[PDB]
Every structure is written in C-alpha cells, then in structure tokens.
Amino acid sequence: GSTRGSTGIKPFQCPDCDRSFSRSDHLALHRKRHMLV
C-alpha cells in the first residue's frame, strides 16, 4: 500500500510495497517475489 511512500510500519518494511515485517528475514522472503516475479 502506501503509508510513507514505501516505509510505513515496522523497522523492516517492503520498500517496494510499503509492507511491514518485524524480521528482516521475513522482509527478504516476501521480496523474493521482487526478484524476477
């Protein structure tokens, strides 16, 4: 969505979606879809 461009909730949010993850690991896990679809 859009909370602050791409940096809303949680210290580890998706800079592509504006998601929110409490773990940097889970961030990368979601961002796996941002590699090559």
Which residues are near Zn ion by CB under 5 A? 14, 16-17
CB of 12 or CB of 14, closer to Zn ion: 14
CB of 13 to Zn ion, least distance (A): 9
Task: Provide the residue type at 32 as one letter.
Answer: K
Is the CB of 9 or the CB of 17 nearer to Zn ion?
Answer: 17
Q: Give the nearest distance from C-beta 31 to Zn ion in angstroms.
A: 6
- 24, with CB counted inside 10 A (0-12, 13-18, 19+), is exposed
How far is Cα 18 from Cα 12, in angstroms, rounded to an integer?
10
